[PDB]
Design a protein around this ligand. Structure first.
Ligand SMILES: CC(C)C[C@H](NC(=O)[C@@H](O)[C@H](N)Cc1ccc(OCc2ccccc2)cc1)C(=O)O
Ligand SMILES: [Mg+2]
Ligand SMILES: [Zn+2]
Length: 889
């Protein structure tokens, strides 16, 4: 397989100026006629004309309307069409082709495919070449004129990019629409949709130009009543880009379309965003709370690409983080402003430090701008997206809001409807940095290391306080562990937002301060510090690093109680838990290894338990934040701190810590579960489709977390509460009633009740499947088998497959069963899925990412399943490449 290197970028010897498509959809085949108006570029050296073209069946090809003949004048190997240079004109010419494709049997969901009764395209990154021949790379900018025809009764709604310029009838009960999109775009932003779609619409008037924009949200008829929140999210997105960035939408119309079968969450095709239904459709009756934030996130995110990705484009796929990390960052700012809850930021940090930190210490570790790739899996990653987002957010932290906005607007104005690279972004930020520091000497050259260096930096602290001098010192060190990408890691530009808390009264002792650490170590001294402070370090999580605060648990407790920054409070709690987990883990591990007949465990710090109770019982404290403090750190976060992690031992450690705290706090939890009911489950706005209260949803999160704690504990009579909860109108509640009932004889009664409530809404059924999969059941393997036989069957819908299996992979005790049966089961699913959808098969590999972090027995079991998969004669390029990289072959 071909390895592509970043440094080898060279412009094509061809230009494609105009694409004119005719897409004729029939029952058994789709006919795609394409005329490319092309030219020879200044880089041309009289090479062969080579088009990408995957799985296309050629009816004809022609140059200047002269039919070309196979073998003589072109060859085609199902991947590349080669037109021998002697037949390629030397000035402007027309290339035309007619190919046949088969969206009905395209279960890989890339290129043109059928999702239920909707025909839909997915072209990012390399899917356009599965529709027609092209030079399928994002620097080939062209104009598009697209005509789609189809059976009118089956496909009454025809959509593509641009303006609909004509609609016409065709003999045989068919009809057509022509869409012309004169602005240049890369082919990965082409889309087409045909179906019996229903819609909601609104008109948005832009802030400055006062342009009327038509907004249409589409879905199949069955679910059209689930579109209202998306439309509200879209309006919000557009207002935020105006308000924060001063950016308005440029086009007459924006369509959002929900489809049932989709490899990812959504896709920003220009004017025609296409979504996984699970990231567009929601109702209060038929969705869990999580859907509301998800739809807000995904509508926002694809909307923000209209600038960062669609108007300012990528020259090549190595710059992916410049559209994805920057767009994630824009959506984070949006969501933070929309939700007004601290849990928006904390949830993103929680993901980065579990999932992305895991990736960055795995054999898959890469910088946010990789130097090479064989498959797009090397790009579409939590590193590129989420660490990329934190790299983009660090500019805002360094510059502050006014100068960040100034630098952002420099980038937009300079690069609007060109291609840009990460260096172009850094440049624009640097111009702002100069303006802010007040000198053209200052630069951000060191900052560029965040794009090229892999691995997570470790930042550690020592302190000094001189009481006589009133002088306080923070000594900071950074280190990044060498890996496969850099043998010698350089110091990064790390911005460290800090506060100093007076431990006597909880007050801030200094103004807003961001320490700029640019060397391997530095000492920051503060004068006129009246009392020894407790430092509040990396406020807001100000750089994507392992923070080693070297604080005592008494200092962390004081921050947890009294600090002003939510992340630091959360982090201090996290750190207290980690110190406890590592200690108890080692005590259990020693008892297992030494086969001890008796041993001691270090109990949970009582003052920490007291602090949790203090916060829980504070009626002015935030319910979302409360839910994080009563939860231990994610397993995938904890794994970053333990070599040869024995999962069973970790499961015993967690059990012990949870039981220690519950033994003190269960009455508090019960009281709160009851006192929260009225506001959490308030039905006042249940039938107001547009009324979304993120604080109220966080109250339900807290109740549902507490209920789980109480049910695991077999708190007296909790089953009564569980059964009553099953009767709630909110799916978050009644599906929670299912999961927490796992600990009781009522589980299967609730399984049936909740199945019946879920079964007639495709997405709700998927949420039910997740709830069953995640259930803490001793007979979980038998339950999956029942899901497989009765519900999932041979569904190829990636939402169904992911729902049945992924939540189960997080079951620490059972997925990691020492027989290896869990690893076996998931490898079987990956291999089955790989036959028709290599992308989703590769997604299903996720639990294997930490394989080399586990105890040696499990390392061996996982490695055995990965090698079994690798040996499959029919393995896809995508899966093979992924597993080869993961297993360090
Ligand atoms: C909210 C947001 C983070 C949601 C998120 N959306 C996005 O990633 C969009 O903007 C992307 N352009 C859409 C996209 C994502 C992945 C992708 O694979 C190409 C590929 C091919 C082979 C192997 C791995 C990956 C193509 C498009 C979401 O879909 O989950
Ligand atoms: Mg289905
Ligand atoms: Zn994106």
């Amino acid at each position: 397989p071909k390895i592509h290197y970043r440094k080898d970028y060279k412009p094509s010897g061809f230009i494609i100026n105009q694409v004119t498509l005719n897409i004729n959809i029939h029952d058994q085949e789709t006919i795609v006629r394409s005329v490319l108006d092309m030219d020879i570029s200044k880089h041309n050296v009289g090479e062969d004309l080579v088009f990408d073209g995957v799985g296309l069946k050629i009816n004809e090809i022609s140059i200047n309307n002269k039919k070309l003949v196979e073998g003589e004048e072109y060859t085609y190997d199902n991947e590349f069409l080669t037109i021998f240079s002697k037949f390629v004109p030397k000035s402007k010419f027309a290339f035309s082709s007619e190919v046949i494709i088969h969206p009905e049997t395209n279960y890989a969901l890339t290129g043109l495919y059928k999702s239920k009764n909707i025909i839909v395209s997915q072209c990012e990154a390399t899917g356009f070449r599965r529709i027609t021949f092209f030079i399928d790379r994002p620097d080939m900018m062209a104009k598009y004129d697209v005509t789609v025809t189809a059976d009118k009764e089956k496909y009454p709604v025809l959509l593509s990019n641009g303006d609909k310029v004509n609609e016409f009838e065709i003999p045989g009960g068919r009809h057509g629409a022509r869409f012309n999109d004169p602005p240049l775009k890369p082919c990965y932003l082409f889309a087409v949709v045909a179906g019996d779609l229903k819609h909601l619409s609104a008109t948005y008037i832009t802030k400055y130009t006062k342009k009327k924009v038509e907004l249409y949200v589409f879905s199949e008829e069955k679910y059209v009543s689930k579109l209202q929140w998306a439309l509200e999210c879209l309006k919000k997105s557009m207002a935020f880009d105006e308000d924060y960035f001063g950016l308005e939408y440029d086009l007459s119309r924006l369509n959002l379309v929900a489809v049932s079968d989709f490899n990812v969450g959504a896709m920003e095709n220009k004017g025609l965003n296409i979504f996984n239904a699970n990231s567009l459709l929601a109702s209060k009756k038929n969705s869990i709370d999580f859907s509301y934030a998800r739809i807000l996130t995904v509508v926002g995110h694809e909307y923000f690409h209209q600038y960062t990705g669609n108007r300012v484009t990528l020259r090549d796929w190595f710059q992916l983080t410049l559209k994805e990390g920057l767009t994630v960052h824009r959506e984070n700012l949006f969501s933070e402003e929309m939700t007004k809850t601290v849990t928006t930021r904390l949830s993103h940090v929680d993901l980065l430090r579990s999932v992305q930190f895991l990736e960055d210490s795995s054999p898959l570790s890469h910088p946010i701008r990789p130097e090479s790739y064989v498959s797009m899996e090397n790009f579409y990653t939590t590193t590129v997206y989420d660490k990329g987002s934190e790299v983009m957010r660090m500019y805002l932290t360094i510059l502050g809001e006014e100068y960040y906005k100034k630098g952002f607007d420099i980038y937009i104005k300079k690069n609007d409807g060109n291609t840009a690279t990460c260096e172009d972004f850094n440049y624009a930020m640097e111009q702002a940095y100069k303006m802010k520091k007040a000198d053209n000497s200052a630069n951000l050259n060191q900052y560029l290391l965040w794009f090229s260096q892999s691995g997570t930096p470790h930042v550690s602290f020592k302190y000094n306080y001189d009481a006589e001098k009133k002088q306080y010192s923070i000594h900071v060190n950074q280190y990044t562990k060498p890996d496969e990408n850099q043998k010698e890691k350089k110091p990064l530009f790390i911005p460290i937002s800090v506060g100093l808390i007076n431990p006597e009264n909880g007050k801030e002792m200094i103004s807003q301060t961001t320490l700029e650490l640019t060397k391997e170590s530095d000492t920051f001294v503060f004068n006129n510090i009246a009392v020894k402070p407790i430092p509040s370090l990396f406020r807001g999580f100000s750089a994507p690093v392992y923070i080693e605060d070297q604080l005592t648990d008494e200092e962390r407790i004081l921050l947890l109680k009294y600090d002003s920054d939510a992340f630091v409070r959360y982090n201090s709690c996290t750190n207290i838990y980690m110190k406890q987990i590592l200690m108890n883990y080692n005590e259990f591990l020693k008892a297992k290894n030494e086969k001890l007949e008796s041993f001691q465990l270090t109990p949970v710090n009582a003052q920490f338990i007291d602090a949790i109770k203090y916060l829980l019982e504070d009626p002015h404290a935030d319910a979302g934040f409360k839910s994080y403090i009563v939860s231990l750190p994610q397993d995938r976060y904890i794994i970053n701190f333990v070599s040869n992690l024995d999962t069973d031992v970790l499961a015993d450690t967690k059990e012990y810590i949870y039981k220690q705290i519950g033994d003190k706090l269960n009455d508090v939890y019960y009281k709160m579960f009851k006192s929260l009911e009225a506001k959490a489950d308030d039905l006042t706005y249940f039938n107001d489709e547009s009324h979304v209260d993120f604080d109220q949803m966080n109250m339900r999160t807290l109740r549902n977390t507490l209920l789980s704690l109480l049910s695991k504990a077999q708190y007296p009579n909790i089953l009564n509460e569980i059964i009553e909860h099953s009767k709630s109108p909110y799916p978050s509640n009644w599906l929670t009633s299912l999961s927490v009932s796992a600990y009781f004889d009522k589980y299967f009664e609730l399984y049936d009740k909740t199945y019946k409530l879920s079964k007639d809404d495709e997405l709700l059924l998927q949420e039910w499947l997740k709830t069953v999969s995640r259930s803490d059941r001793k007979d979980i393997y038998e339950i999956l088998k029942k899901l497989e036989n009765e519900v999932l069957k041979d569904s190829k819908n990636p939402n169904d497959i992911r729902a049945v299996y992924l939540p189960f992979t997080n079951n620490l005790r059972r997925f990691h069963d020492i027989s290896g049966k869990g690893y076996k089961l998931i490898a079987e699913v990956i291999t089955k899925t790989d036959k028709f959808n290599p992308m989703v098969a590769t997604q299903l590999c996720e639990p294997f990412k930490l394989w080399n972090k586990l105890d040696t027995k499990r390392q061996e079991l996982m490695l055995n399943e990965m090698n079994t998969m690798l040996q499959e004669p029919q393995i896809s390029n995508n899966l093979k490449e992924y597993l080869l990289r993961l297993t360090n072959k």
